[PDB]
RNA sequence: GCGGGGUGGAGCAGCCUGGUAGCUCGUCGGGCUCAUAACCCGAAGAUCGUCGGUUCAAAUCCGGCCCCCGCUACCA
C-alpha cells in the first residue's frame, strides 16, 4: 500500500495493521457501491 | 353431478384486521384462509391466501338465492338442478402494514378486488387505504366495497358510514364499484354477495398468444414426514395462468428458482422440468387453463421448493423468453400521500443511495441507485426479475417505522 | 374435550416427601479504597387468588368459587 513507516510508531495514535484493514473495507465498498 | 372445470376467475380480497377478511371468505367458501400454526393461535392473516368455491343458479326462483355452491336449489326452494356459472377463486391479502409489501405479490394475479370495511370504525381506516391504492396500482380497479359488521352497528351509523363509502370511491378510479350489506361471521346474504361478484366483476379479456406464464404465489413439498421413498413427489408450484395455459408432462422453465456461484459473483438458474400433474384442489384434470391459481406438481427437488423459497415464481417454457437483469430501469410514479397509516406527510423527493423495496408483480426486492431520473429509476440489486414484457407493475415501498408502505407504482421497460 | 400457575418491587425457586415463603436481581443502611464502581454483610420485604375440605398439624393431599387465562379438528 505504499507504506510510510513514519506512523508504526503508535504513539498518539492507533496500530497500522488494524487501519489498512478498515481502509480496505471501503475501498471494496465504494469500488463494489455503485461505483459502477 | 356437475361436470368439473377449473376456475375462470380470480377475487383477491384486500382489507385490514377486524375488518372481516379472515369470515368473509369463511363465508363465501365455507372454508378459513388462516392457513399456519403461529398465525392458527395469534389470529393475524400472515399468509396470501387463497381460496375456491363453486357457482349454480336455480332459474326458477326469485332473486336472489338460487346462488349456493352445491347441486341443489332448496336453498331458494327450487326443485331443479341449477345451470353452472363457474368455479371461483379468492386470493387473501394481509392486513397489517407490518406485512403488507408481500401481498403485492399476489395482486399481480387478481381477475378483481375486495375490500372489506369496519362499520364499527371511523373514518378513515389505516390499511384499508393502502390496499385499495395497490389495486389503483395493478391496473385491476374492479373492486367489491362490503360493509361489515352490521350486527354490532347501529341501523343508522351503518348509513352513515355507507355514505361515506360511495363517498371515499367519489375521487378515485372506483366511482363504479358496488356497496352490498353482507357481513363476515353472520353469513347474511352471501348469496346476492356471489351475485354482485358475478354481475359488477366481470372476466378480464383472455388471450393464450404470448407466452404462456404462470406468475406463482405459493409453492410447497406433498411429501408427508415419514413419506417411503416409493410414493416420493416432487414439488407443487401454484399461480394463475394468465397468458396462455400450461400441461402435465410439458417442457418448461421455472425463473429465477435456483442459485449458483457462477464464475466467483452471485447469479442464478433458469430450471427445466415438466409437470407430474395439475389440479385445484380434490377433482382430476391434466392441463391448466386460465382461470384460478392453478397447483402444478413437478418433477424437480422438493427442497428447492419447501418454506415458499421461490415466492412469486414464474413458470413459463424451457423455449421460452422471459429475461433476468440485476440492473433493472423502472418508470415509477410517485403516490399522492401516505395511504395506509394512522399519519400522512409529505412526499419528498429524494436523492439516491436510499434502500427501498421494489416488489415485482408477484416477485420482491430490494434495491438503490446511482442515477435518479425524474420519471425513471437505474437500480441495482442482488436477484433477476420476472419480466414477461413492456411495463410490467413492479411497485416501490419506503420504510415506515418498519412498515414499509407506497411510494409509487412504476412499470418495468425492456 | 380441556387444561395450567394461581409466587415479595422483579426469576419464581420450593407441590405426592407435613410444620422455618427459598434463594436470586432489585430499595434503605452499615464495611473496605483517597474516592468511585466491582466486592462484603445486616434490614426492609410477600407469607402461597380466595371459600373450604382432607391434614395433631400444610402450597405441600383434596374440592367451592373466581384472576389471567396456555396447548382444542391443514400436506397440490
Ligand atoms: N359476528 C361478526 N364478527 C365479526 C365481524 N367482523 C369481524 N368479526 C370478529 O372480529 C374478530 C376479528 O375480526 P376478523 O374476522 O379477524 O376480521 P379480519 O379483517 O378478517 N382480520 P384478519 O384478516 O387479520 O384475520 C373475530 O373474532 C371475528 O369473528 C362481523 O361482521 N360479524
Ligand atoms: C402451491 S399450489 C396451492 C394450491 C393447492 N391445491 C392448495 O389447496
Ligand atoms: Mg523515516
Ligand atoms: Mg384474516
Ligand atoms: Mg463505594
Not at chain 2, 36 to 65: D, Q
Not at chain 2, 99 to 118: E, F, H, K, N, Y
Not at chain 2, 222 to 248: A, D, H, R, Y
Request: proline letters at 5%; aromatic letters at 6%; glycine letters at 8%.
Amino acid at each position: 500500500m505504499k507504506r510510510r513507516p513514519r506512523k508504526w510508531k503508535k504513539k498518539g495514535r492507533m496500530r497500522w495493521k488494524w487501519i489498512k484493514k478498515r481502509i480496505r473495507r471501503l475501498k471494496r465498498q465504494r469500488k463494489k457501491e455503485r461505483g459502477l | 353431478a356437475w361436470p368439473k372445470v377449473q376456475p375462470e376467475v380470480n377475487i383477491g380480497v384486500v382489507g385490514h384486521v377486524d375488518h372481516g377478511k379472515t369470515t368473509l371468505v369463511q363465508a363465501i367458501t365455507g372454508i378459513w384462509t388462516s392457513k399456519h400454526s403461529e398465525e392458527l393461535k395469534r389470529g393475524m392473516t400472515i399468509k396470501l391466501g387463497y381460496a375456491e368455491t363453486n357457482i349454480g343458479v336455480c332459474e326458477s326462483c326469485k332473486k336472489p338465492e338460487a346462488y349456493v355452491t352445491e347441486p341443489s336449489c332448496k336453498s331458494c326452494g327450487s326443485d331443479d338442478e341449477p345451470k353452472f356459472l363457474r368455479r371461483i377463486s379468492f386470493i387473501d391479502a394481509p392486513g397489517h402494514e407490518v406485512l403488507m409489501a408481500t401481498m403485492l405479490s399476489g395482486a399481480a394475479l387478481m381477475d378483481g378486488a375486495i375490500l372489506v370495511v369496519a362499520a364499527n370504525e371511523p373514518f378513515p381506516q389505516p390499511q384499508t387505504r393502502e390496499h385499495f391504492v395497490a389495486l389503483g396500482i395493478i391496473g385491476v380497479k374492479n373492486l367489491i366495497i362490503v360493509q361489515n359488521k352490521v350486527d354490532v352497528v347501529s341501523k343508522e351509523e351503518a348509513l352513515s358510514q355507507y355514505r361515506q363509502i360511495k363517498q371515499f370511491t367519489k375521487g378515485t378510479w372506483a366511482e363504479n364499484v358496488p356497496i352490498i350489506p353482507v357481513s363476515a361471521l353472520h353469513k347474511i346474504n352471501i348469496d346476492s354477495l356471489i351475485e354482485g361478484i358475478e354481475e359488477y366483476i366481470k372476466t378480464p379479456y383472455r388471450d393464450l398468444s404470448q407466452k404462456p406464464v404462470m406468475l406463482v404465489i405459493r409453492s410447497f413439498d406433498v411429501n408427508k414426514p415419514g413419506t417411503q421413498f416409493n410414493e416420493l413427489k416432487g414439488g407443487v408450484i401454484g399461480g394463475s395462468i394468465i397468458q396462455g395455459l400450461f400441461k402435465v408432462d410439458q417442457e418448461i422453465k421455472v425463473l429465477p428458482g435456483l442459485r449458483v456461484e457462477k464464475q466467483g459473483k452471485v447469479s442464478y438458474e433458469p430450471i427445466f422440468t415438466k409437470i407430474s400433474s395439475i389440479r385445484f384442489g380434490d377433482e382430476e384434470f391434466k392441463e391448466a387453463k386460465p382461470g384460478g391459481l392453478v397447483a402444478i406438481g413437478t418433477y424437480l427437488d422438493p427442497s428447492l421448493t419447501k418454506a415458499d423459497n421461490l415466492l412469486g415464481s414464474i413458470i413459463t417454457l424451457a423455449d421460452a423468453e422471459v429475461p433476468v437483469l440485476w440492473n433493472i430501469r423502472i418508470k415509477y410514479n410517485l403516490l399522492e400521500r401516505v395511504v395506509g397509516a394512522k399519519e400522512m406527510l409529505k412526499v419528498d423527493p429524494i436523492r439516491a443511495k436510499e434502500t427501498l423495496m421494489l416488489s415485482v408483480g408477484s416477485s420482491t426486492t430490494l434495491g438503490i441507485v446511482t442515477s435518479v431520473k425524474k420519471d425513471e429509476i437505474e437500480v441495482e440489486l442482488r436477484r433477476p426479475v420476472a419480466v414477461w414484457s413492456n411495463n410490467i407493475r413492479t411497485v416501490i415501498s419506503r420504510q415506515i417505522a418498519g412498515r414499509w408502505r407506497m411510494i409509487g407504482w412504476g412499470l418495468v421497460e425492456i
